[PDB]
Amino acid sequence: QGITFSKNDVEIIARETLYRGFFSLDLYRFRHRLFNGGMSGEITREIFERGHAAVLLPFDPVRDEVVLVEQIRIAAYDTSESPWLLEMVAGMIEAGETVEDVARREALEEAGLEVGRTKPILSYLASPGGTSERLSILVGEVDASTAKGEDIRVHVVSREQAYQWVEEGKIDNAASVIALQWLQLHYHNLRNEWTK
Amino acid sequence: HHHHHMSTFSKNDVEIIARETLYRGFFSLDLYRFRHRLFNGGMSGEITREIFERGHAAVLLPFDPVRDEVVLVEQIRIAAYDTSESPWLLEMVAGMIEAGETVEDVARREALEEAGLEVGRTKPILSYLASPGGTSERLSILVGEVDASTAKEDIRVHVVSREQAYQWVEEGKIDNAASVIALQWLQLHYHNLRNEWTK
């Protein structure tokens, strides 16, 4: 048995833009139903609004390799030894675009990769206590030997080593962790489905 | 070309020029202004990024290894509203870390306050950056040994089999990063973890 309430059980009174620049910081003001019946008082939350993203895990099922992109993410600085991260191909979704369209485009522009078949992995909320951001991950069939290079470096690594880097903390951004854990759970069936 | 790993930079390669306050309230928004070294040599032009600063978090996956059960907590996360069927989410126990606190002390406190759980042994799962393009937030996940029989801000406690919780990840019913990461880890490690904590 899962969630109890739906959108009909929340009242969003107003949304105040506290800051607008490249992105926005909004104040949500809302009331919601309580598990023991009744309505909450008025609540406020400061939510970072940056739109939503498409993520592609480029996987070569023949070679059992993945393609990773390395670039600086300055927000990693305070809690990481280096702010250069190994990540999945990703891009923000603009109005009217699909996840698959963005995923395929960025794989070509960021890593020089033609993608064959795709499959959905998962769609997740990055940090629902402070941002609306949702990221939708696909796995994409690639020939990793064709991988080819904001300032990005393209890496080709075995699935085994990439997953080991998740275990060791060398890969530690949510999208990459989720994608590579999924691959560790599904690569046997995937390699069969895509080499059959 | 690409770098095949069968064939780098440090903080010294970053010039943080300024961190400019854009907003200070419950949380803070800062403008990072910086230059960084380029893979082909030299320094970038000036780059600016709007970064949401909300501190860092401890996350606990409460796992009953005798029963093969996990404890979830349900509560509203209004930020989920615009892209979700419901803003009420099934999540891991979690809380923000204050200065001088350990990850594990926050995890234990929240488990006890949030779901009435005493925690026994613990193991780190992993520590991840939620969304490094827009926030500094790091969350450190532990798995904690619990008696799922003792499980009892408006929060509801669910106790489900591990297999059910993982199936809900597959289905999209659990779809917040902390819980997806923790439950995929558990699906990869449960056989050895159960053997270790029932030895």
XYZ file of C-alpha atoms in Angstrom:
395
model
C 0.000 0.000 0.000
C 1.463 3.322 -1.131
C 0.643 7.025 -1.211
C -2.599 8.309 0.304
C -3.228 11.700 -1.303
C -3.380 13.245 -4.781
C -3.150 16.781 -6.182
C -6.765 17.387 -5.108
C -5.469 17.247 -1.514
C -3.125 20.252 -1.882
C -3.992 23.925 -2.324
C -1.176 25.996 -3.822
C -2.137 29.491 -2.677
C 0.522 31.443 -4.573
C 4.000 31.217 -6.071
C 6.320 34.170 -5.474
C 9.442 34.601 -7.592
C 12.151 35.558 -5.090
C 14.923 35.745 -7.687
C 15.040 35.620 -11.481
C 18.188 35.418 -13.579
C 19.273 32.440 -15.625
C 17.096 30.297 -13.325
C 14.464 31.238 -10.753
C 13.951 30.799 -7.033
C 10.255 30.549 -6.222
C 8.417 30.592 -2.899
C 5.580 28.075 -2.903
C 2.763 28.931 -0.490
C 0.376 26.055 0.068
C -2.016 24.085 2.270
C -2.399 20.309 2.251
C -4.379 17.524 3.883
C -3.072 15.686 6.940
C -2.907 11.935 7.471
C -5.019 12.221 10.631
C -7.634 14.208 8.735
C -7.765 17.981 8.609
C -5.869 20.637 6.713
C -2.404 21.960 7.416
C -1.761 25.581 8.114
C -0.107 27.697 5.444
C 3.333 26.348 4.421
C 6.186 27.974 2.484
C 9.147 26.442 0.642
C 11.992 27.996 -1.361
C 12.195 25.906 -4.542
C 14.891 26.219 -7.197
C 13.318 26.150 -10.670
C 15.691 25.184 -13.468
C 13.494 23.133 -15.770
C 13.975 19.440 -16.445
C 16.516 17.260 -18.197
C 17.059 14.290 -20.472
C 19.938 11.938 -19.646
C 21.476 9.269 -21.874
C 23.537 6.324 -20.656
C 25.579 5.347 -23.742
C 26.083 1.603 -23.624
C 27.850 -0.590 -26.158
C 26.372 -4.080 -25.548
C 28.872 -5.794 -27.859
C 31.926 -4.300 -26.128
C 30.318 -4.095 -22.659
C 31.558 -0.480 -22.472
C 30.055 2.871 -21.528
C 30.876 6.372 -22.741
C 31.281 9.067 -20.087
C 31.780 12.834 -20.409
C 34.037 14.800 -18.090
C 33.531 18.490 -17.374
C 33.700 20.907 -14.480
C 30.628 21.367 -12.241
C 31.617 24.195 -9.919
C 28.902 23.347 -7.377
C 30.809 20.144 -6.583
C 33.771 22.200 -5.348
C 32.960 22.440 -1.645
C 32.382 18.699 -1.091
C 34.631 17.071 -3.727
C 38.370 16.778 -4.171
C 37.905 17.910 -7.785
C 34.936 19.689 -9.395
C 35.557 17.895 -12.711
C 32.948 15.109 -12.794
C 32.461 11.987 -14.890
C 28.860 12.136 -16.069
C 26.163 10.938 -18.415
C 25.262 12.831 -21.550
C 22.492 15.233 -20.618
C 20.602 18.307 -21.718
C 17.735 20.511 -20.632
C 14.384 19.942 -22.322
C 12.822 22.956 -24.017
C 9.101 23.268 -24.657
C 7.753 20.774 -27.184
C 10.855 18.567 -27.253
C 10.788 14.942 -26.155
C 13.226 13.173 -23.858
C 14.411 10.917 -26.664
C 15.050 13.810 -29.052
C 17.186 15.676 -26.515
C 19.005 12.518 -25.438
C 19.936 11.593 -29.014
C 20.993 15.130 -29.905
C 23.282 15.555 -26.898
C 24.921 12.166 -27.446
C 25.941 13.372 -30.902
C 27.023 16.885 -29.876
C 28.671 15.989 -26.546
C 30.256 12.621 -27.395
C 30.044 12.290 -31.203
C 27.845 9.209 -30.783
C 25.215 7.971 -33.198
C 22.590 6.207 -31.075
C 20.712 3.137 -32.272
C 17.985 1.699 -30.077
C 16.981 3.362 -26.817
C 15.065 2.126 -23.775
C 13.816 4.078 -20.748
C 15.711 3.511 -17.507
C 13.963 5.710 -14.919
C 12.752 9.280 -14.353
C 13.680 10.778 -10.979
C 13.434 13.905 -8.855
C 16.948 15.147 -8.111
C 16.194 16.654 -4.691
C 12.497 17.261 -4.069
C 13.110 19.203 -0.862
C 14.651 22.141 -2.711
C 14.193 21.832 -6.458
C 11.485 20.775 -8.908
C 14.102 19.295 -11.230
C 13.169 15.978 -12.835
C 15.660 14.023 -14.957
C 14.548 11.297 -17.357
C 17.213 8.687 -18.197
C 17.369 6.498 -21.288
C 19.942 3.852 -22.188
C 21.191 4.204 -25.736
C 22.883 1.636 -27.956
C 26.254 2.929 -29.215
C 29.515 1.745 -30.778
C 31.855 2.968 -28.059
C 34.894 2.890 -30.362
C 33.338 5.764 -32.376
C 33.183 8.062 -29.332
C 34.708 11.452 -30.135
C 35.071 14.786 -28.357
C 31.812 24.239 -22.382
C 34.947 22.076 -22.225
C 34.307 18.309 -22.361
C 36.548 15.242 -22.372
C 35.080 11.958 -23.647
C 35.955 8.694 -21.886
C 35.357 5.081 -22.882
C 35.379 2.611 -19.997
C 34.262 -0.947 -19.367
C 30.935 -1.334 -17.599
C 32.765 -3.214 -14.824
C 35.187 -0.361 -14.205
C 32.524 2.321 -14.394
C 30.439 0.501 -11.804
C 33.522 0.007 -9.618
C 34.029 3.786 -9.783
C 30.466 4.206 -8.468
C 31.299 1.830 -5.603
C 34.544 3.728 -4.879
C 32.938 7.201 -5.009
C 34.829 8.316 -8.126
C 31.474 8.610 -9.913
C 29.092 10.263 -7.467
C 26.537 12.432 -9.280
C 22.940 11.220 -9.059
C 22.267 10.688 -12.779
C 25.378 8.586 -13.331
C 24.961 6.591 -10.127
C 21.342 5.750 -10.943
C 22.122 4.883 -14.547
C 25.123 2.671 -13.768
C 23.394 0.867 -10.899
C 20.521 0.195 -13.299
C 22.961 -1.121 -15.860
C 24.557 -3.399 -13.281
C 21.085 -4.842 -12.588
C 20.017 -5.155 -16.238
C 23.008 -5.559 -18.562
C 22.608 -9.344 -18.981
C 19.113 -9.060 -20.436
C 20.060 -5.888 -22.307
C 23.127 -7.413 -23.976
C 20.933 -10.319 -25.109
C 18.120 -8.101 -26.401
C 20.493 -5.847 -28.360
C 22.860 -8.506 -29.766
C 19.983 -10.818 -30.785
C 39.447 11.214 -30.028
C 38.383 9.729 -26.699
C 40.274 8.536 -23.647
C 39.878 4.771 -23.331
C 40.790 3.689 -19.850
C 42.858 0.695 -20.987
C 45.333 3.062 -22.701
C 43.673 15.158 -14.102
C 42.741 18.594 -12.803
C 42.616 19.689 -9.163
C 41.210 22.650 -7.279
C 44.484 24.459 -8.114
C 43.149 24.511 -11.695
C 40.120 26.618 -10.630
C 40.087 30.391 -10.018
C 36.987 31.139 -7.927
C 36.747 34.907 -8.444
C 33.650 35.520 -6.316
C 30.654 33.914 -4.682
C 28.041 36.648 -4.850
C 24.885 36.474 -2.763
C 21.793 36.530 -4.969
C 19.273 35.598 -2.295
C 19.408 34.874 1.449
C 16.400 33.345 3.148
C 15.720 29.901 4.547
C 18.215 28.711 1.934
C 20.681 30.758 -0.116
C 21.351 31.292 -3.808
C 24.905 32.262 -4.769
C 26.498 33.332 -8.029
C 29.769 31.489 -8.495
C 32.095 33.468 -10.759
C 35.149 31.525 -11.817
C 37.699 30.565 -14.444
C 38.990 27.026 -14.950
C 41.750 25.254 -16.845
C 40.895 23.830 -20.263
C 41.737 20.302 -21.353
C 43.800 21.659 -24.260
C 45.598 24.221 -22.092
C 45.033 27.730 -20.774
C 42.213 29.157 -18.678
C 38.598 29.647 -19.637
C 36.897 32.982 -19.871
C 34.814 34.086 -16.902
C 32.000 31.625 -16.175
C 29.050 32.336 -13.881
C 26.600 29.844 -12.363
C 23.565 30.299 -10.092
C 23.923 27.660 -7.365
C 21.364 26.803 -4.690
C 23.040 26.365 -1.298
C 21.018 24.353 1.189
C 23.658 22.429 3.107
C 24.049 18.663 2.934
C 22.049 15.673 4.068
C 22.232 12.304 5.771
C 20.024 9.535 4.364
C 19.154 6.230 6.046
C 17.850 3.102 4.340
C 16.211 1.202 7.230
C 16.670 -2.482 6.435
C 15.395 -5.410 8.503
C 17.723 -8.247 7.420
C 15.833 -10.968 9.271
C 12.516 -10.150 7.593
C 13.919 -8.756 4.283
C 11.859 -5.602 4.802
C 12.509 -1.884 4.335
C 10.916 1.073 6.114
C 9.704 3.987 3.983
C 8.366 7.378 5.056
C 5.631 9.214 3.155
C 5.202 13.005 3.137
C 4.434 15.889 0.802
C 7.261 17.460 -1.201
C 5.617 20.425 -2.904
C 8.466 20.763 -5.404
C 7.353 17.444 -6.948
C 3.923 18.851 -7.781
C 4.489 20.086 -11.327
C 5.920 16.817 -12.739
C 4.410 14.070 -10.548
C 1.106 12.255 -10.140
C 1.188 13.352 -6.501
C 3.497 15.496 -4.366
C 3.318 12.886 -1.591
C 6.489 10.787 -1.984
C 7.708 7.482 -0.560
C 11.209 8.246 0.719
C 14.139 7.325 2.895
C 14.648 8.727 6.362
C 16.767 11.843 5.934
C 17.802 15.143 7.473
C 20.076 18.123 7.009
C 23.472 17.989 8.702
C 24.440 20.916 10.918
C 27.965 22.011 11.779
C 29.737 19.584 14.086
C 27.275 16.752 13.424
C 28.184 13.419 11.876
C 26.251 11.872 9.009
C 25.471 8.874 11.184
C 24.170 10.897 14.150
C 21.715 12.754 11.903
C 20.606 9.484 10.316
C 19.967 7.886 13.723
C 18.145 10.919 15.102
C 15.812 11.176 12.104
C 15.102 7.437 12.114
C 14.029 7.695 15.741
C 12.034 10.938 15.444
C 10.587 10.179 12.011
C 9.700 6.488 12.327
C 10.437 5.488 15.927
C 13.312 3.251 14.830
C 16.368 2.427 16.867
C 19.294 1.621 14.548
C 21.879 -1.086 15.145
C 24.795 -1.656 12.804
C 25.282 0.597 9.783
C 27.169 0.502 6.500
C 27.809 3.344 4.063
C 26.050 2.977 0.745
C 27.413 5.983 -1.093
C 27.508 9.769 -1.073
C 26.204 11.652 -4.105
C 25.681 15.104 -5.560
C 21.955 15.577 -6.134
C 22.258 17.918 -9.118
C 25.716 19.429 -9.516
C 24.663 21.748 -12.349
C 22.480 23.763 -9.973
C 23.056 22.923 -6.309
C 25.962 22.046 -4.070
C 23.840 19.561 -2.125
C 25.550 16.281 -1.240
C 23.600 13.444 0.379
C 25.366 10.654 2.251
C 23.415 7.387 2.382
C 23.808 4.689 5.043
C 21.941 1.409 5.412
C 20.857 0.848 9.003
C 19.903 -2.408 10.714
C 16.375 -2.167 12.161
C 13.614 -4.294 13.610
C 10.842 -3.511 11.134
C 8.249 -4.414 13.808
C 9.060 -1.285 15.846
C 8.201 1.275 13.124
C 5.295 3.497 14.204
C 6.054 17.649 9.383
C 3.264 15.151 8.636
C 4.702 11.689 8.015
C 3.324 8.192 7.445
C 5.378 5.038 7.951
C 5.174 2.079 5.578
C 6.887 -1.288 6.046
C 7.234 -3.247 2.815
C 9.185 -6.216 1.566
C 12.458 -5.376 -0.151
C 11.088 -6.950 -3.319
C 8.036 -4.684 -3.239
C 10.078 -1.536 -2.684
C 12.383 -2.393 -5.570
C 9.403 -3.203 -7.806
C 8.028 0.271 -7.032
C 11.319 1.770 -8.222
C 10.966 -0.191 -11.469
C 7.381 1.045 -11.849
C 8.159 4.679 -11.104
C 6.212 4.730 -7.843
C 9.440 5.493 -5.968
C 11.284 8.107 -8.015
C 13.301 10.422 -5.766
C 17.057 10.120 -6.177
C 17.882 9.153 -2.594
C 15.448 6.236 -2.507
C 16.228 5.014 -6.033
C 19.965 4.960 -5.284
C 19.493 3.278 -1.913
C 17.107 0.618 -3.209
C 19.141 -0.177 -6.328
C 22.145 -0.600 -4.016
C 20.116 -2.878 -1.759
C 19.004 -4.931 -4.746
C 22.686 -5.383 -5.661
C 23.938 -6.160 -2.126
C 21.092 -7.673 -0.120
C 22.249 -11.296 -0.280
C 25.626 -10.511 1.281
C 24.188 -7.882 3.641
C 21.602 -10.302 5.050
C 24.284 -12.955 5.555
C 26.497 -10.445 7.369
C 23.785 -9.202 9.739
C 22.327 -12.647 10.537
C 25.692 -14.443 10.903
